[PDB]
Amino acid sequence: NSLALSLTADQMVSALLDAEPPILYSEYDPTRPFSEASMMGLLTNLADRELVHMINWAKRVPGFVDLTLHDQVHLLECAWLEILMIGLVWRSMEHPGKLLFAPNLLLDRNQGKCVEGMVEIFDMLLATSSRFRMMNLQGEEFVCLKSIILLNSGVYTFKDHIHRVLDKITDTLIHLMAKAGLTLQQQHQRLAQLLLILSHIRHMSNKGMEHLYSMKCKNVVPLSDLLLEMLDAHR
């Protein structure tokens, strides 16, 4: 039996908020802007460091360490890029038109052009951020969404435990929306709107995975063994 299912709404929220990884910085070269090799160099470097924190964030998501190591590997392998992306989008929310990869690396669409095939991914990311902003997404909602991604994305590619935890997180989201004063109809409507965005985030991940693969095959910038293993897991 998992300790996750025994937690209350507030306890779940607190655990997730407490598990949050830190906001990392990019290399501090101010006169780097900006080629293809340097652009993807900064981003992949950042991604590699964020992954390490993500892996330790996941272990602090209630119900996750109750799975076998193999299930943990599978879930992270499937969801890793969706999780980076939703994090990016969240951070970028209060910065319309811009992607806050790091506090010292706030990029806009024009810079996306710097890398071949990344401007399309940029626009999708920017649209998601705006959507999140216009929905007034709250941090408590965001952490619920992010852990939902972790447990859900790879769940059908394998069970009962994960879906019980997923249900638990659903209870938590509603709990937050009720706490915020929303009416019943507003609660299920907002629940749906939020979850529907996960479909787009999945789409972005798939597109991003293909882009990262082509960048690999161009052998422009070397990728860490870790990032390469996370990429290779998607075959």
Binding site: N56, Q72, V73, L76, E229
Partner: peptide, 9 residues
């Protein structure tokens, strides 16, 4: 695989 080592470390 690196992921396994990190997940356990």
């Amino acid at each position: 695989k690196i992921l396994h080592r990190l997940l356990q470390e």
